[PDB]
Nucleic acid binder design. Sequence first.
DNA 1: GACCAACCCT
DNA 2: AGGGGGTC
Length: 580
Amino acid sequence: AKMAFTLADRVTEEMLADKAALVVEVVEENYHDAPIVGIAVVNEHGRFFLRPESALADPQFVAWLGDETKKKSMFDSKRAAVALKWKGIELCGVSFDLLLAAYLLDPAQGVDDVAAAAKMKQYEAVRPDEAVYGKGAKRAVPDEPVLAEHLVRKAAAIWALERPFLDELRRNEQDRLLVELEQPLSSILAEMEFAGVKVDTKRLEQMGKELAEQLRTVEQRIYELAGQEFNINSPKQLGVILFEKLQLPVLKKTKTGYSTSADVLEKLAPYHEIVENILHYRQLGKLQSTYIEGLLKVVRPDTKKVHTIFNQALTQTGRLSSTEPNLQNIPIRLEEGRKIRQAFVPSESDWLIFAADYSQIELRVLAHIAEDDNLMEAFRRDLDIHTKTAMDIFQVSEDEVTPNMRRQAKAVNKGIVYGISDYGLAQNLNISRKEAAEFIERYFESFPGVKRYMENIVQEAKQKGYVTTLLHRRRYLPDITSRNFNVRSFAERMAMNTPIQGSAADIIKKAMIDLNARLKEERLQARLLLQVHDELILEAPKEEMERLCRLVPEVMEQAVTLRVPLKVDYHYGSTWYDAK
DNA sequence: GACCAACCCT
DNA sequence: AGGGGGTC
């Protein structure tokens, strides 16, 4: 049903109204220095398609994109913004972003294109991107006539839906969450990704060579112990050597057949010398293949930086997500892996990396929302919460809390936050189910308000159909009413966990917005680089380091007021690794 | 190209 | 709790 639209040869004044639906199409998944293939505008005066080359050599048009008074509605404005930044062009005045609007309304829907959003409000006059571009190897930009129609249909759909979405957002009391939190956050994220993080490639390469040598050493040793040669990365091949040939005990079974997971092999270490070498092999293999080679692929040879993409509209809890590369899972737990962080360096000379992290934010949030007196009081005293929990479940004095008692108390705390069952805790603490249920029972005696909260929250999700966060983020949990025990059980755990994890997301988001405002007021050159759930990473001049030590934590700490204080720790140094 | 099993992070 | 090579 051909939609009417002008395929313009040049930009005209009536295309630059102070209110428009704009589509700036970037079909590359990774939008960094990626082409723009089409522009559509839809407004009071009609519907228009433009060609980038024309539209972007045009001062009038670029002035308009840049103009903050001229208000745009879009879908995934960060994608457009970053693609335009790589071309030296600024995008401002995005008053409404449908992708973020749909995301707040229902993360479960998985809305990843305009069509998905449109179905939510019964609008079907737009095609799914995957249908116009195909998928995988057949991904292709179409001919002008087909492209032109699709862009305009998305612009047109954005035009039609903004009011319907803002109405529902308002009804959920999520309108401020879109306009004050997520949409501003999108601009800060656009800057972060474009700035990117500088990498020392020679430092990486050297590490690759050392690993290479060590992998060969341990690999040969494995063959020698095995008494033959086999592919160690092959489950089928490794299982045979471990369980048929060396006759090691079959502790666990996979769908495929044999389980060679770490927690399994560690149990088998005593029987044979070959097990410890294999775990080590894999550990090394993992760093070489994922983190050295995978990183060296994505470094941009020109700028010497990696430029991640932060997904703002993906997780079910309101958290961010990072890809190409993921900088939110760089090794930190074992020193061998941790060293990788020495490869991440400031972008200018005489600058330093500055890391700031919240301390036990999830448990602090639980205390606040649960209103547990015993937990509130623990954090007001600034105690060690795991040592404290140990004391309370084991009924002992600080003097008597052994490292094992702590480790155990800690596991209980995570479990409460993830809302696990006696079985899950038993699996984690490697103890009997009865013992696990004794711990939990003890925990709830020590913290009755937390118990009260878990019961009440499951009941509220049952009554309302969703659970909310502090800043009115929302998550629907249909399965909570399901008659299957396992499906219902999982729903209840989400019921318990989401307001904790989700409210923590909200807090750090606000901190990021607040922090940005302060950095500008202060006219500081410091800049945000990464966010890893409970921490922010910046780079700034050595001269600016002392000020940031006061400023960054103050801003993060005052983001919200709760019944307990928030606590931030910081460090800085010449590399990410040294900011410890 | 799609799954599985494995291992990285908060 | 939430994410991010081998085989057929």
